[PDB]
Symmetry: D2
Subunit: 385 residues, 4 copies
């Protein structure tokens, strides 16, 4: 199960670079040089990296230092053949962002958050990224009077609409991907799920510039079915990017390596991305546990990739198995994919077999055969066929 760069595996600088500072505990690992991580991730078989502005250029860097940091970084990309498919802005760490960036109550902060963003879209385009992520982690509230949500959506729509004006004015090929999260670090975060983000995009001036960046662990923090939300994103044409990780239920945001957490969810998510032909990056947004030294870092990043490739093999065996395709017909998946009434409304209304003469008892008696199907999918996952 060996990754190659053709598998499209990517990692944030902040993921392998997490020093292991948590709400109760100091760092347990020294800071990695971005150079270092590029080199070590290319050896493991990754395809590229991603960054916040602030991961690559230290906050408050002179323009003399910015350019330095960028030079070095670009040399290591040249030396390794790594790409930069996606970039994003840190609008959550510095204290100025303690009430948000694009929805902060202070208007000055809000203009500062769009200037800091625009600066990093230029760099992102220079470095070749196709997708620009926006996680509004400070956009929200711990209290009901602190934030009027209708005014805060007006602000959010204004900031995204100015960024879409900027990008079309510059000529850039770059799209935006909004990342939902339901809570943490705010008490409640605005656009908390995939469905809220999808809905919001349909109100922006140019909706075809924006899609979603869902993360495994974030929709599971609301107790939702991650493969069902991604289906919906796929159904809308809006799955621009995806963050892969693991999460054990409804609790703080664990960011465990991909395959950890809900491992059957993980199986149905790979099944779906592979059968829909998702062709963007398989990005890992994870934190190696603070228990680990640098050995455990690179082990944990390697197991992200491994577990994807194992689950891809088992989902492919599942769909390719004749006894499975027979089960799928027994459970009427074929019929789910046929129109209910291609005949149209009038013919439906005149069809007596639809109502007046429909035998509800006979229909109700038929078994759906779902459990036999599900066990087939379990035997496939476990390799126990």
């Amino acid at each position: 199960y060996q990754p190659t760069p053709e598998d499209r595996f990517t990692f944030g600088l902040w993921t392998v670079g997490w020093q292991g500072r948590d709400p109760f505990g100091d760092a347990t690992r020294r800071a990695l040089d971005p150079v270092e991580s590029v080199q070590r991730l290319a050896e493991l078989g990754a395809h590229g990296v991603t960054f916040h502005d602030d991961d690559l250029i230290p906050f408050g860097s002179s323009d003399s230092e910015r350019e330095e940091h960028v030079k070095r970084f670009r040399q290591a990309l040249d030396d390794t053949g790594m790409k930069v498919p996606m970039a994003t802005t840190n609008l959550f760490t510095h204290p100025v962002f303690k009430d948000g960036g694009f929805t902060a109550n202070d208007r000055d902060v809000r203009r500062y958050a769009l200037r800091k963003t625009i600066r990093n879209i230029d760099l992102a385009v220079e470095l070749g990224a196709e997708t620009y992520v926006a996680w509004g982690g400070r956009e929200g509230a711990e209290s009901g009077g602190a934030k009027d949500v209708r005014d805060a959506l007006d602000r959010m729509k204004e900031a995204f609409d100015l960024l879409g004006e900027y990008v079309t004015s510059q000529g850039y090929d770059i799209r935006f991907a909004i990342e939902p999260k339901p809570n943490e670090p705010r008490g409640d975060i605005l656009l908390p799920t995939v469905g809220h983000a999808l809905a919001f995009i349909e109100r922006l001036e140019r909706p075809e510039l924006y899609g979603v960046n869902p993360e495994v662990g974030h929709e599971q923090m609301a107790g939702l079915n991650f493969p069902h939300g991604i289906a919906q994103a796929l159904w809308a044409g809006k799955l621009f990017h995806i963050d892969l990780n693991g999460q054990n239920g409804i609790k703080y945001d664990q960011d465990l390596r991909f395959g950890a957490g809900d491992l059957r969810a993980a199986f149905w998510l790979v099944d779906l991305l592979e059968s829909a032909g998702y062709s963007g990056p398989r990005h890992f947004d994870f934190k190696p546990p603070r228990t680990e030294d640098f050995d455990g870092v690179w082990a944990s990043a390697a197991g992200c990739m491994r577990n994807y490739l194992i689950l891809k093999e088992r989902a492919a065996a599942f769909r390719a198995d004749p006894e499975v395709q027979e089960a799928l017909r027994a459970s009427r998946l074929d019929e789910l994919a046929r129109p209910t009434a291609a005949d149209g409304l009038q013919a439906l209304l005149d069809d007596r077999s639809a109502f007046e003469e429909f035998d509800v008892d006979a229909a109700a008696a038929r078994g759906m055969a779902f459990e036999r199907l599900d066990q087939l999918a379990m035997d496939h996952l476990l390799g126990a066929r």
Copy 2:
């Protein structure tokens, strides 16, 4: 705190009529006649009632019996001055709907679910309802291979699009309100939140025919902030109807009387509906606990109405209190409501005070004063001013 019918309080027949059958236990109360409940709810000060088809006309009734049931019911509405603002279809009880109605894997079932719906839209319009709710409680799965979600959304969009064709062909003034729920009775239900429902409507052929019917307890079963979801629905123009009840956290769907459960949520929700000028029905979709006899039924329905009217008084005192309006300015709510950059993109880009000369430290030092605000809102709720 006395309701009158001008408060727009409504109840489902199924709410006061719940016999108290639960997954572990038999009925504890006899069946109410719909007549009875209309009379008793008009005495308590309610404005109207709502129904499933199957609450009012027993499943499988001849057309001779349907008309009877409807006659009787209409007399009791005449005798009491009660209205029928909303109606809906039962597509969840009968065993034929064990895989869903509009997304069942069997195509025959799906045509039967639209015929059963259309029949009840006619009756709904006859009885004067303005809103037709659709809760797809059986639309979903307990297992990943049982349902392809992209085909199931195609089916759902086809069923809603044929119902919008039906209503515009008949000339009816009636809109649809889709009610989300994340789970129960299915393992996972499709369009599980407000945001998923909002997103989905924007893909139907005629989106201005459809809005949402959110329920308190349903978004809390995902751990989400119910007043934040309703703000978003208000912001989209799509809050057609609302279900009011109480829920203690993430667990089975409790349906406790309104004000029970999360009582500070309840306060910020009344604050919002009243300050936005929501003017639809305040509908109660609750179940009096099976511990209660008919005395406890009508006590529980009365406390729904009482608790709304108490929280309306305290939210109104809150917003009317000068010291509160002063706090709101101290916390910059005023600034949240101003555009970030009415000057436009170019002027933002040329403004040095937005970036080059923005003092981030000074901005970061300012306190948001949220806690003083929040305690004011607490003293108001508790009447301890």
Copy 3:
């Protein structure tokens, strides 16, 4: 992966016999005769069955009918070689139990709940059961003033203490196993977790008569780590019985077949029961989904057994793998099992290497190597070694 009766697999009559009545829906399957289920479960390789009183003898049966029902049942046990290791009381279905059995506010109800219990302990002993389960599913409240919890624990301790007097007075070899559940069908249920049940037993007059019956899905409905709770029960000597099933997170009690739900939890639970040498019944307390016909019933019961036996094989390969035992030493599991201070308190206090000269930096730098361990356990589960 073929079960035999030596695997100690058991099922409740109520599990395969669930008609599929849920809070929103009628039965979807006819009632099974207990005879039938005994015969069909013996063919699949099960070791025995369990019952509520009310599953085997219809509520209100004359003593002429009781004996009949029991005769028939006993013949089918004779004909099949099935055992009855465990029995329990239904103190939740009938409306008289709407406030509880042993903690109902009415004292008359409470005496009735102990008489109904004692009657079924006699039958249980006749039929050879070793364990008598008590799930207090109606013991609790939806509201804070409805139940004083300290008086309700006095009542619960009084009922269990009289049942322990009864059993020691009759000479019976039978122990009690209390089953925790956090909620459903009550808003909150008393002794909601394993730890609450364990604590409570230590206050009964004869604590060595009582242990716990934990269920997978119940501790997961609180978001807790089921293998950690069973370790604690094992550590106390109190794991008398266990209920096996699957649950997807914090929501209504799904009762999916064992292996469904949290499949990595399932792996670490089999690892533990097998390495501790648990030798009681592996009981399945599950409901085949109401989507299924009788074919899907017996498929779902068979997959419970299958998935146990697959996970037993993979946990055994895991612990037997030298590279795994090497990893365990690398992560210091060996040291966890050594006493911290067998030298005693004084020697600890005089040991300078424990404090004055302990090098905290060097210790802090050591990696725990947990991620490499965890991936080994993942490759083992998936059979990808």
Copy 4:
């Protein structure tokens, strides 16, 4: 609603002193001097403070600096009349504790964690504390093979048993209070609930030395009923101390001021502590939100105290209201407090009115009148009587 020191309100140095560093964000407030906080908390009406070792004496302080820090602190206690009822150890911040203190896999770490503890019990006794808290925040795992839980409970019991030997050997009047938490910062924390902690104490050599320190927000992070767990702790005689705060459901540990979060829980908890006559400290273990400056700090600490005193007044009015005491009898709370069978087992067995002649229908028909009771308790809370 003015606190005085006779109300027994206390605060941790770490609570008002939280700089607002979170998993995504830098500090937003400078460090407070312990002196400062003592002075400011005495002005607001608090009764005392509590500390970790490491809050009061910087980690790695020479013994020349320790004594200095302690001198200063003691002067400010003298100048203000503040007490120190409780102290505890920081065994979670420093990287050496990344796998735990008392259950770390490294035995060296474990001896170091008991030496660091013992040192601070001496200081605690010097400063007059009565209760010594132990929150094992690093005791647990993110992965199943990382920790054998039975060996880890052996270690935990060994560490607590040596601390009980230490304290009885020194002659100290000091008891231990174990604080449960279900998760965060570990994936799962050992003894995750009140009931697990209660159970564990009953296995220590001297159980009458140990009780529990429950925190509001921690049992709510498992979705449990905090007043029900404290009743159980009261029922066992083991409520040594309590941490008061607010939490909105199952998510990261918010630590909002007391009264925020679940405000009806807050009401029933004050009702219980006041009617049981709890006479330990009312300690606040909260964090003023990082949005706040020092003004918002002291506002947030003041609202903890205010909200306790408002809820005490409304619970007292509730229990003192004749119409309430009438409701309580209508709902049979009186009967809950009577023995079920003071007559004994034999008389129960011979009582025909308990079984043979018990009218189950009549009993089942009686209403429990809980909803009327609950609304009375709501009108009382809101002051709407």
